[PDB]
Amino acid sequence: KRLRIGITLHPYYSYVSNIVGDKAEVVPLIPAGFNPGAYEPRAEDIKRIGTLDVVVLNGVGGDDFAERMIASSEKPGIPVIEANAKVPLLAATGMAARGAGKVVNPGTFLSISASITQVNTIARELGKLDPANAKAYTRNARAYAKRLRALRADALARLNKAPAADFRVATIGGAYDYLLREFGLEVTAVVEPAGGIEPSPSQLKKTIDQLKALDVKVIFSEIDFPSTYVETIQRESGVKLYSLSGISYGDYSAGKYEEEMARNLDTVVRAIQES
């Protein structure tokens, strides 16, 4: 009776939940506790696609697993929502991105303005599939966007207090590229991620060497290093390492996206205010 909407990544559960409310069912494609980098979808997950009416996709490199799961299902021609259709995309850069054939950065969801565009795109397409609830989906998308804009405005107001020189930062990877660009942060250099969260002494040395060579004091890292590594990096290079949430862990909830974006924007503001 109610429309059954498939979702891939955690932010899309928040988007769809806030758009539909109780009027439709929001169905995660892959279970909570599992990251699709790497996790192999079960027959149970593929069978579930046969119970859905539409699948919302990031569709720009964030959820390639979803298109493969759909092709193997009982509904390969199921309606799909390309959430990023109207979102201007950022290039994926570095040795790793080039070596993987990655053209675009898919983390559009870490931008508030991009999330608003995706929410409006989902709400429009959902109403085409379920005309009876089209008015409600639009009204909910408007209320959701309003809350999201207030979050963007609040962070932008707190950064307005800070001088333009403080906005010169650097990164380890490009995971937060859409967020940093949106909040007017100038990325001086991008240090290529080497060796994971627990790098070898040789891999850590190379990172510290690349960091001390920089003229910035704040670094946003894609790699969430344990405190001992952070402590060593900071003491040996004089930079301050900050990590943000990629909104990809634990339970699916309607509030997850906004709760974690609030915190990410708190870290960015704290980083610049402390510099």
The answer to whether residue 163 forms part of the interface with Na ion (CB under 5 A) is no
Task: Please give the C-alpha separations between residue 241 and each of 22, 112, 266, in angstroms, as whole numbers.
Answer: 41, 23, 15
Closest CB to Na ion among residues 188, 253:
253
Considering the complex, state which of residue 95 and residue 153 has its C-beta at the smaller distance from Na ion: 95
The answer to whether residue 24 forms part of the interface with Na ion (CB under 5 A) is: no
> Does the footprint of Na ion cover residue 205 (CB under 5 A)?
yes
169 binds Na ion (CB under 5 A): no
**Stretch in the footprint of Na ion (CB under 5 A) among 15-23, 177-185, 196-204, 266-274:** 196-204
* Distance between CA atoms of residues 260 and 118, nearest Å: 18
Q: Does 178 bind Na ion (CB under 5 A)?
A: no
The contact mask relative to Na ion for 40-79 (x = CB under 5 A, - = no) is ----------------------------------------
The least distance separating Na ion from the CB of residue 100, rounded to whole angstroms, comes to: 9
Contact between 201 and Na ion by CB under 5 A: the answer reads: yes
Per CB under 5 A, does 252 bind Na ion?
yes
> Which C-beta is closer to Na ion: that of 46 or that of 129?
129
HSE-CB at 20 with a 13 A cutoff on CA atoms is 27
- Total binding residues for Na ion by CB under 5 A? 7
Q: What token pair was written down for 173?
A: 């990877």
Q: Is 30 in the site for Na ion (CB under 5 A)?
A: no
Q: With binding defined as CB under 5 A, does residue 98 bind Na ion?
A: no
Q: Which residues bind Na ion (CB under 5 A)?
A: 80, 82, 175, 201-202, 205, 252
